[PDB]
């Protein structure tokens, strides 16, 4: 009634939690309730929507505003517009983020302490989770005028290296090699917009490179001494120039703004680490510009 | 007999015996067991690239500070077929076998990330997917590195865009010595394939 | 039907709803995971039901 | 028959050949080497098509 | 590439057209130029018989990493062309006739595809 | 509800990485990825090939020039033809590598570090891989000619122990024992070839041995103290002799040259560990002559 | 239908071409493995497909 | 050809000897024998009854 | 068919011969074992066959 | 997609080499070879006698 | 105070020690925590058969 054990000696490995970063599998951890299947219900009437919120084609499909220009009476024709925000009429076509502001306090009397500040839009906020992007930018180009503004807009779409200017400790544009003479846009995907009546366009720029994925890497880090995951990031800018002076009578402003919203369409991720130098970290305001900031290390 | 040189090439065969499959097939059943038809299999065999890995604790090391060393060499698999192609493609596996001198009254682990290929270890996070072993109790760090990568192959010793596909960095709290055995994983491949290099025969330094 | 040399591969999934995963089309929720108030999460099962195992035998 | 290479093989003699305005008389047939099986290379058909040069012409400038 | 050869009938010799890609880019031990007669002649090439075949033709596929060729902003120079001498010029003794060669080479383009409209040309 | 063990104890060995040195299992390796079915698609455009270019097939039957002769208009009948390069026309039948050069530098004024060079075709590079080889092995002699040049060409196989002279670093043939006198080829399987037109003839000398399987040691090491493994490599060689001296105009060139072509069909081997005495070691070409090489060491 | 007193061997196989595996004939590369863009990977089974087990239920 | 692990980390404790005071059940002792299967026949002709 | 209350008891076994195994009669060799050059080795069986694990894949 | 575990605790015992003594079972020794199934053909062929 | 191991690797027969390479297949255990090191030879034979 006791027999022998006919049953091979199996061979084995002492590995706790092997692949505890994968999304997928059967994890090992005890619960601290009653029942081994202790399990919620679906999430019909929990959150006011039911739609899934975490998609991410629902979540980098939330526009938000990247610029607000101004475009004056004055300004010349076939040469970007740069009146008031950075970068100009020149909108890098791409999923990362390409502005930040440096917050500058001090420690000592003789040293400063800088801080790069991104503002982040509900796509931009996304890729910088992951290490690749690849995703049909989508961008709409509102003007802020009256009935009796009228004028002509082009925005064309220059693929490749974007022309900046790398200032010790930021990127900036080049608006000095996007005029009409030195660049002109007679090759280039254009549209040109009429602002009789016609206010908005939606414009969807594909995925166009050469590779197969682009880096998230953006604005992070990029400066004079280091910029080429700037470059990499990016494949292309739009760029807003005045076919026609914005004609305008004496009766209504001489100023029209326009707003550029951005989202992104058909996106796909690779790595599930981020392509950053350190970690990443939401910006908490401090309560007043003397004091300071967290400071997250790498160390282990 | 016209003047001119010709073609119509005249294949000869010595030795009328027997089909030589038949031949091939009856000599591996008495000396083998075993038929290795192709060297993609010899990819997927774990051959050691090194036999004592020194390091230091508390430092983050790419695996890029002994693999560019031993590409040279030619001594595993990965290195010495390498040379008869152009190309690549395909996650990398490898093992940490321990060979330290432990002590007790510390308590060792073996981290592993991932860096981008060729960056140092400062400019690099450490918030990815990652592996933990404990040498006490499982002396072999078994990680697999996938491919995730810009291009859909890539090359040999290419320009100055760096970091276009992933690579694994190593951690341990302790100075630890190692034996590290690399191979490709399920698919891994060679290709574009061009003629070999040369190869080294051995050393005597003679007497005069 | 999925072309793997191991033998089953991993944590037998369940199905859920008619769409592309992403690119905007509001997917809806109660459509993905199939489990409502029912036979169809285990421990209300058990007590609709009414097997041994919720008494202690 | 060999791999990744070519030898000399004393063609037929042949092969004005054509390539679209230069032939190429070729007393005999040139022994070709060539991709094997050709899968070529990267995705540029799919990014856009093409362009020609009569559509090259057809662009607006200002 | 196609090449052109043309030589009197009491000349022989033999050339090799091999090419290899990545050759100014990979480690100097993994060239071309720096291995045996028997690893240059393993590359993917082709014959050149100076009595048996006065013109030789090959297709070079796509040879690059990544997808379709950056025409703008760079120079990339992917595969490197080759004519290497198996056996040396074999004429007469015969001074002041001139015992010659005189190899031509033609080269153009197959599997087009010519995409995104730029601005920009390199200089 | 929660009722006890009725399975049995089960037997246990604690091995990590059982068995890592076999092509086929199910590895143990944790992936740093995001799901456990990390899994690329086939090779469909991919590499400018869709042949499979790691078949042992495909790669040993990529054919090499190991030989380019030199037949003078002055060289006798039955006497291998000898000049130029090494070996002459005796070419070892057989898949692993029988030439080697030696470089020699100095470590001081009384001592010089040699150094054994060889150069492999792709298929004797494949076969420093492995133990043990049996192959059907191709030849291709060709003539380079004029249409002028006239002259009859013998390639017989004479099998197992080759002739040979060895030195004290290496080994070289012996022609002297290869003349018409004390070796006639009247016995030998033999093809006597014609150049008034013809140029090139494909000889396939199947595999004929006593063994099973030939080893794959070669010329590694071999030299007077040690060659009983470069015997043991091979089982024949083909000698090429000329039958009729080679008949040619003054207004020709004196000279014809041979160039033999190798590869190899029907390949087999057997055991994944090279039979040399030191490892698979590529030879880096040093930058000036003076300089040193790398040195493999065997200690663990 | 393979001689082994061994229950199940290993690393249960799929198929792949009709030729010889050595001796050249230029083996093709889509034809050994058969796992093109389709509902044979998957990863991309899973979503097109669209099992509960992608969305994280 | 060497596919990864699809199997959990299954849970384990090191008991040797499970529930050895019981009289049915799979016995853990290595026989020092010739084969696994070591078992002697019916007790037909061994006592003198039945 | 074989008495036993250990389920399944050990290494599943092949078939072999027609006489007694002692009490000399020459026991035929290629008779004991039935794996001769053919589909029934599984190293042969996987080339022959041509199943995806001889490439790699 | 992550769910816990069902599975029991097992019992274990910690032997290398049980029952190594027998002539029938499934051997755990790790061959130093290409193929998990190395195997040899049949005596056809190798001995004088059959 | 030490981390024992042991490797195994392959000689043709009756070579020394420093007439091989370490380039083959191995198999390593470490007797602190397996103290049984099971490793089996394959035949690797120029002959169907062996004299002694």
């Given at each position: 009634?006791?027999?022998?054990?006919?049953?091979?000696?199996?061979?084995?490995?002492?590995?706790?939690?092997?692949?505890?970063?994968?999304?997928?599998?059967?994890?090992?951890?005890?619960?601290?309730?009653?029942?081994?299947?202790?399990?919620?219900?679906?999430?019909?009437?929990?959150?006011?929507?039911?739609v899934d919120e975490m998609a991410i084609g629902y979540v980098c499909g939330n526009p938000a505003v990247k610029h607000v220009l101004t475009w004056k009476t004055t300004d010349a024709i076939q040469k970007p517009i740069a009146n008031g925000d950075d970068w100009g009429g020149v909108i890098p076509v791409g999923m990362p983020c390409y502005s930040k502001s440096i917050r500058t306090t001090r420690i000592s009397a003789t040293e400063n302490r800088e801080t790069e500040v991104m503002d982040a839009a509900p796509c931009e906020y996304v890729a910088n989770m992951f290490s690749y992007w690849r995703a049909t930018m989508c961008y709409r180009i509102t003007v802020v005028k009256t009935a009796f503004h009228t004028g002509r807009l082009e925005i064309f779409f220059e693929p490749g290296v974007i022309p900046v200017k790398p200032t010790v400790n930021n990127i900036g544009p080049d608006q000095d090699r996007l005029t009409g003479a030195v660049a002109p846009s007679d090759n280039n995907y254009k549209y040109i917009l009429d602002l009789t009546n016609d206010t908005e366009v939606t414009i969807r720029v594909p995925f166009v490179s050469n590779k197969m994925f682009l880096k998230t890497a953006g604005i992070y880090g990029a400066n004079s001494e280091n910029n080429w995951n700037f470059h990499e990031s990016f494949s292309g800018f739009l760029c807003i120039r005045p076919v026609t002076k914005l004609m305008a009578p004496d009766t209504v402003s001489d100023n029209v703004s326009i707003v550029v919203w951005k989202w992104a369409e058909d996106v796909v991720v690779v790595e599930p680490k981020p392509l950053t130098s350190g970690p990443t970290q939401v910006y908490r305001p401090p309560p007043t510009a003397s004091t300071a900031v967290e400071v997250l290390n790498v160390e282990l | 007999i016209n003047i001119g040189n010709k073609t119509?090439?005249?294949?000869?065969?010595?030795?009328?015996?027997?089909?030589?499959?038949?031949?091939?097939?009856?000599?591996?059943?008495?000396?083998?067991?075993?038929?290795?038809?192709?060297?993609?299999?010899?990819?997927?065999?774990?051959?050691?690239?090194?036999?004592?890995?020194?390091?230091?604790?508390?430092?983050?090391?790419?695996?890029?500070?002994?693999?560019?060393?031993?590409?040279?060499?030619?001594?595993?698999?990965?290195?010495?077929?390498?040379?008869?192609?152009?190309?690549?493609?395909?996650?990398?596996?490898?093992?940490?076998?321990?060979?330290?001198?432990?002590?007790?009254?510390?308590?060792?682990?073996?981290?592993?990330?991932?860096?981008?290929?060729?960056?140092?270890?400062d400019e690099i996070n450490v918030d990815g997917p990652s592996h933990i072993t404990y040498p006490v109790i499982n002396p072999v760090h078994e990680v697999e590195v996938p491919f995730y990568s810009q291009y859909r192959k890539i090359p040999i010793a290419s320009t100055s865009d760096k970091?276009?596909?992933?690579?694994?960095?190593?951690?341990?709290?302790?100075?630890?010595?190692?034996?590290?055995?690399?191979?490709?994983?399920?698919?891994?491949?060679?290709?574009?394939?061009?003629?070999?290099?040369?190869?080294?025969?051995?050393?005597?330094?003679?007497?005069? | 039907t999925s072309e793997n040399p191991k033998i089953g591969p991993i944590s037998e999934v369940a199905s859920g709803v008619k769409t592309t995963a992403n690119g905007i089309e509001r997917i809806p929720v109660i459509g993905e995971i199939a489990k409502p108030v029912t036979t169809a999460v285990k421990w209300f099962a058990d007590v609709v039901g009414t097997v041994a195992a919720i008494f202690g035998w | 028959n060999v791999h990744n290479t070519e030898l000399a093989s004393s063609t037929s003699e042949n092969s004005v050949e054509t390539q679209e305005i230069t032939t190429f008389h070729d007393v005999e047939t040139p022994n070709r080497i060539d991709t094997p099986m050709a899968q070529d290379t990267s995705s540029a058909r799919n990014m856009d098509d093409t362009h020609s040069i009569i559509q090259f012409l057809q662009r607006p400038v200002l | 590439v196609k090449l052109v050869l043309n030589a009197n009938p009491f000349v022989a010799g033999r050339m090799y057209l091999a090419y290899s890609p990545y050759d100014d880019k990979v480690d100097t031990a993994r060239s071309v130029l720096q291995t045996s007669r028997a690893g240059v002649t393993g590359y993917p090439g082709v014959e050149l018989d100076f009595q048996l075949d006065n013109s030789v033709e090959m297709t070079i596929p796509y040879a690059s990493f990544q997808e379709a060729y950056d025409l703008v902003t760079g120079t990339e120079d992917f595969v490197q062309l080759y004519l290497f001498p198996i056996t040396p010029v074999l004429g007469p003794k015969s001074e002041s006739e001139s015992s010659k060669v005189d190899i031509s080479v033609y080269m153009w383009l197959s599997n087009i595809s010519l995409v995104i409209p730029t601005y920009r040309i390199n200089p």
């Open positions: 009634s006791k027999p022998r054990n006919q049953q091979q000696v199996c061979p084995l490995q002492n590995v706790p939690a092997w692949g505890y970063s994968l999304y997928k599998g059967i994890d090992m951890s005890v619960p601290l309730a009653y029942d081994p299947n202790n399990e919620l219900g679906d999430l019909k009437d929990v959150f006011p929507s039911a | 119509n090439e005249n294949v000869i065969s010595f030795f009328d015996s027997t089909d030589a499959e038949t031949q091939n097939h009856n000599a591996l059943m008495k000396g083998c067991g075993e038929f290795i038809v192709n060297l993609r299999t010899l990819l997927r065999t774990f051959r050691t690239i090194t036999d004592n890995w020194i390091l230091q604790a508390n430092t983050k090391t790419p695996i890029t500070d002994l693999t560019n060393t031993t590409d040279a060499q030619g001594r595993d698999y990965m290195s010495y077929l390498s040379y008869l192609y152009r190309f690549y493609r395909g996650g990398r596996r490898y093992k940490f076998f321990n060979t330290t001198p432990l002590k007790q009254s510390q308590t060792c682990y073996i981290r592993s990330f991932l860096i981008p290929r060729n960056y140092s270890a970091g276009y596909d992933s690579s694994l960095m190593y951690f341990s709290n302790t100075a630890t010595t190692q034996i590290v055995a690399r191979a490709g994983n399920d698919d891994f491949t060679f290709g574009w394939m061009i003629g070999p290099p040369q190869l080294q025969g051995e050393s005597r330094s003679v007497a005069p | - | - | -």
